[PDB]
Amino acid sequence: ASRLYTLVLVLQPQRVLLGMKKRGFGAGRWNGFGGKVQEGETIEDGARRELQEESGLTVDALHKVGQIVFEFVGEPELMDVHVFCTDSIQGTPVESDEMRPCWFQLDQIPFKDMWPDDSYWFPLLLQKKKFHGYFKFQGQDTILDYTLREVDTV
Numbered sequence: 001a002s003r004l005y006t007l008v009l010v011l012q013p014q015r016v017l018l019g020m021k022k023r024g025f026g027a028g029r030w031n032g033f034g035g036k037v038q039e040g041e042t043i044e045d046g047a048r049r050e051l052q053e054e055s056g057l058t059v060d061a062l063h064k065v066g067q068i069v070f071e072f073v074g075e076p077e078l079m080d081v082h083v084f085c086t087d088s089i090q091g092t093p094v095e096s097d098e099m100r101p102c103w104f105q106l107d108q109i110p111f112k113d114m115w116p117d118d119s120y121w122f123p124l125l126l127q128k129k130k131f132h133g134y135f136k137f138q139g140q141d142t143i144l145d146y147t148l149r150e151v152d153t154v
């Protein structure tokens with residue numbers, strides 16, 4: 001039993017756009033743009049919607065780069081996160097109710113203020129490798145189990 005989510009990373013040649021999450025789950029960490037896929041939209045549609053809702057930005061194209069499954073101990077629903085990349089943004093990022101956007105240099109990624117699983121998979125994305133990951137968390141700080149591999153098809 002799993003719930004569909006999207007995550008979009010805006011990755012340009014020498015920088016990445018992250019947003020400080022201002023409220024809800026994982027508030028106080030720098031995240032990519034995403035959320036729950038709704039009834040009546042495709043996964044990709046949901047990714048675009050979340051990006052626009054959270055940052056103002058629209059894009060030409062999204063590229064599938066990964067899938068991560070998250071289990072949180074004591075929560076019934078697994079999270080099935082479809083991860084996308086883009087380097088064809090249209091607009092300037094702006095702050096929303098949910099996210100405060102900021103550009104980071106690729107050697108200045110704020111890992112200490114990110115989800116701890118990010119240290120494992122985010123480098124694969126920077127290296128342009130497609131991946132499947134699974135992370136079992138106890139609360140929001142502790143990884144109990146994980147798997148991570150590269151794949152040919154996301």
Ligand SMILES: CCNC(=O)c1cc2c(-c3cccc(Cl)c3)ccnc2[nH]1
Pocket residue numbers: 005006007025026030031032033034035036070081114115116117118122
């Ligand atoms: C490189 C930036 N990484 C992330 O943006 C990132 C997000 C998450 C989430 C998460 C929680 C709620 C909704 C969604 Cl879509 C994801 C859970 C664990 N690790 C994460 N990492």
